[PDB]
Amino acid sequence: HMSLVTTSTSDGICTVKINRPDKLNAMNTDVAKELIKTFEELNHNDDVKVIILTGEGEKAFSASKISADESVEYAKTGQLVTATVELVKQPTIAAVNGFALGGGCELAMSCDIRIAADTAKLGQPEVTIGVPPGWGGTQRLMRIVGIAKAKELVYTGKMIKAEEAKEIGLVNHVVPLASLQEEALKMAQQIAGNSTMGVQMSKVAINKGRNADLDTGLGLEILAWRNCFTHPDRQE
Template sequence: MIAAVNGYALGGGCELALACDIRFASPNAQLGQPEVTLGICPGWGGTQRLLRIIGPSRAKDLIFSGRKITAEEAFSMGLINKVIPSENLLSETRAYAKTIAKNSNFAIGISKMLVNRGTDANLDTGLKLEIYSWAVCFSTKDREERMRKFVEKK
């Protein structure tokens, strides 16, 4: 899933973006977790996803202060993958999605699972999952066809 943020993504909107795999934003985007200013904590994954994406210290800064940040600041801390001019945001996001869609759905799904599981696993466990999954990918017809086309330079 790819988020294209063009405006405010505060609280639940930010948490929705955090649930995506990739996040693009226009320069006029503002992101944040302002829940503490209302006397509540983030409740839709903000504490857990934010810390995994930008680290605990930066996550605490955004959550404890309740401040809004610009797309550029979000990019500098790794919250946003790319800042794209507003007029190009949707077209570039769609073009990126089409690039991904050309690849193997199975291999992308396995890779996503490995990255997500690797976040919570130690390196040894993550590497074991990866080599097992790599072998599973080798058993698919999709891999066979894609490698054949590669070798034939198609």
């Protein structure tokens, strides 16, 4: 179904793995709901400080004859899992180990930081079926890579390698697969070394001010800044 295992310094680095390698870690509603409950619906426990999310099998991160009314609930489940991943307390590092197409790519775009392997191919092929990307791909892909590249990808519904994904910023870095998880830990243990209060107030400020004008975002930032100043992490 889904795996979790935690160790780091303080050992609060939690690797979360999608466990369906027989079907290329494809995401159905069961995987979405289990992801929602693993990310605990907009919070977490206090042991974990950084989350590294990937899919087992070393081949794919994650790669409808239905009831037009039921597709609204389907897209709602997708939106809910993407928001639960996107707004979790700790930072998330998406280790894209191979294919990330459709929902999978959307999942990858819900995370804060993406470290892809030189074997990773991303895309949104929903438009080849007759549907748009229904789990936030029409919005998050734009907000990450620019309207031009997002439009190109969604219109063509094509697949792009991790190198051009790094070129357009869809992934933060590209490393060899053999080193992928290694790098995924190396960044995480770096974020875990910093103050959790500062890191996660920064995350709240960023995730809230991405949707507002500069003045409102600065208000969010100053409020989070005072909040962190009321914390012992600042003085020690």
